[PDB]
Assembly symmetry: none
Homo-oligomer: 224 residues x 4
């Protein structure tokens, strides 16, 4: 029992992939997941019409904090499990959306994300690839654009190679409507502005984040 | 009430613990600092008997050992209560301001947490980008979120094109710790975490086992430790 | 701002055409509509599948929605296309004397809590009711949220019942069937796969608790007279008004 | 990773000196101490107010903490040891020497995995005797397995069939808590409901916290029991 809200800023939402707009592919993924309700949050009528054409529900928003807007308009109860799922991943498997919802429900954490192993040095050293370090229980310690965990010895010698310990954070956030409300009631944290990672506000205010281990010119076109 | 344990290291590119600094060995200067802090008991952990005699002659206490396992052998040998707060202070810091030794003790005394430590602001970008300087990122209450040799937190916009300059938010972690005797035993009992060996950072084991570490900005910025002859003159001249 | 929906069941073994039964000059359904107007509801909708009921209600200026209890409410929520944040209070058409004030209360309670549902309860003073499976007991947390609803006697007073079951304390609460919920919730509740607990106790509010949602419960501000399905109940009510 | 505390209940109307009862060559509590060792606990403390039990436990290389609610007794051990708030404690009774070591570990895993305050266990009830027995605590879980309520009353109530079945869960007396949750627990004011049901865990539910209940279809107070256990071990 969960709801999917897809934040689509805006021109990425409508970029074509294979006869469908980027956003439509994510709605199909959200829909394949079993979600009871699939809302696309937009600030544009070009997007709101593409999704509307598609038979997908739409909530207009100003131009996670966008999800707080939707949560308020739909008046969701604090207990409603919400899975973010960004509009930038049109091929995200329908099962990791479920995984994220289920993990959040199993546990009583405030936020549930997902990460994927990095098997590439270029990715590990890319400040656009967000890295996450985990404790033994899978809870996150930190999220950063820095290369963490820093492998001292191998990087003492070189940066053309990477071990098998890096985890790439994906933008699929599980959380309760009550948590989003709390999220936006907190004063923005200083750490979130330096890294430019919304996720850090939750760590700044002492909340935990469970992490399960599953933009530009693309090859996605080929992949699907 | 808190205890101070001073591990007197010897490893160094010479005869460190006993090196003279204006008439007294360096190890006795660290002892004086620990007394200044109000510790009710200062123990020097050493394996060399000549180091032992210098401490004893100064009226200090000594626990012959066989660098944190050293600490545990001392809590072992002294049968300290679990609740006993212990502050590990370095044998090569003759000028360690006593205020900070007290600061860690009190910080730890006040929180129901595993470890307590200190950090200092980083002003030079060289230091921010040097892996031998450990960086630490805090939560709204000073609990370490993470310790790293990578530059964290990552300044997105400022670092976008290389690393030339630095903001004012960076924190360099000081290797001065506080903990209960019970916690030192657990810590040392644990199986080494995968994380601590990747970063080569003992403190990561604490976070890995889902325990917390409280960090504070040192009340006074600590003079550097003494490991080179040029540091000795710096020290000797300074004291 | 809130909406009242009044399910009108024509059907009734011991009382045929019950919504239209005459009570001191007007049809029962109409009396319920009056109570609901007294509550301050902005919109009152009588849900019926009979044209005659609808005519009775329209004659007295009432709005009608031509249509499994909760499911029936969903049809109405559908056809009226209520907005999600719309507060609905379900009031039975068998209750011509339901105190207007408890209708307001459920709405007021729901209005400031982001809860799935809001309900009411009444103190149980006799041990017969406490031990009566037909009386549904509810046990609340410190903030008025239901821990559990049951036909069993809860909370169980272990030291007292070790002695005897012919007397109770002041810790018992009889659950009342008047509910408050937002239209967004109703239209979701209704597609949930029936909970296994639900079927054992034969309590459908157990579906909310089983899915991890909350049910706010407050002590009704007034004790409601019971419904009307018996011909004897009809004369009684006839006499009380 | 996790600590185990074994309250060595001494008194028993029918069984005097429980902890030191020989069960095939070893006192009852030592057997419990071995189950906790097999569990993988990193530390096992026996909570007792008797010198006999303290000597038996110590002779066996076990740790002892010489110690008004039961959960308050755990609290004394917690202050005595000075565990950090994050420390995971698993409370295991000294009168259950057959307690499989993996349910102990299971309770510990559940609490660690779930960021909840308390974790516990339950097993299916099969016969009507137990289901209608007020000393047999029934619990009713939600879809995610979190407790809805604990009662000495027969819940859930089978309307038609009671006017036994197959959806009844009996609560076990083993808990997983963090050290910070025992202090919070202990500082709260007693709830009005715990006293009516005479159930300590109801306090948790009255203050809005959650209780995770795991199910695993798998207690020595009387002489009958000593034999049922001796003659099974």
């Amino acid at each position: 029992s969960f709801v999917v809200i897809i934040p689509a800023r805006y021109g990425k939402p409508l970029v074509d992939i294979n006869g469908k707009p980027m956003i439509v592919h994510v709605l199909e993924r959200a829909r394949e997941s079993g979600a009871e309700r699939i809302i696309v949050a937009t600030d544009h009528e070009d997007v709101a019409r593409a999704v509307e054409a598609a038979g997908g529900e739409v909530c207009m928003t100003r131009a996670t904090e966008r999800l707080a807007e939707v949560v308020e308009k739909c008046a969701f109860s604090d207990d409603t499990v919400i899975v973010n799922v960004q509009g930038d991943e049109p091929m995200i498997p329908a099962t990791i959306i479920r995984q994220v919802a289920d993990n959040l429900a199993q546990r009583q954490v405030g936020m549930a994300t997902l990460a994927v192993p990095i098997h590439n040095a270029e990715e590990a050293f890319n400040p656009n690839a967000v890295k996450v370090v985990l404790d033994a229980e899978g809870y996150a310690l930190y999220f950063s654009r820095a290369t963490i965990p820093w492998d001292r010895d191998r990087f003492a010698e070189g940066l053309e190679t990477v071990g098998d310990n890096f985890l790439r954070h994906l933008g699929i956030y599980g959380y309760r409507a009550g948590f989003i409300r709390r999220y936006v009631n907190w004063q923005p944290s200083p750490l979130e502005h330096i890294e430019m990672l919304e996720q850090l506000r939750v760590l700044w205010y002492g909340e935990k984040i469970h992490v399960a281990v599953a933009e530009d010119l693309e090859r996605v076109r080929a992949e699907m």
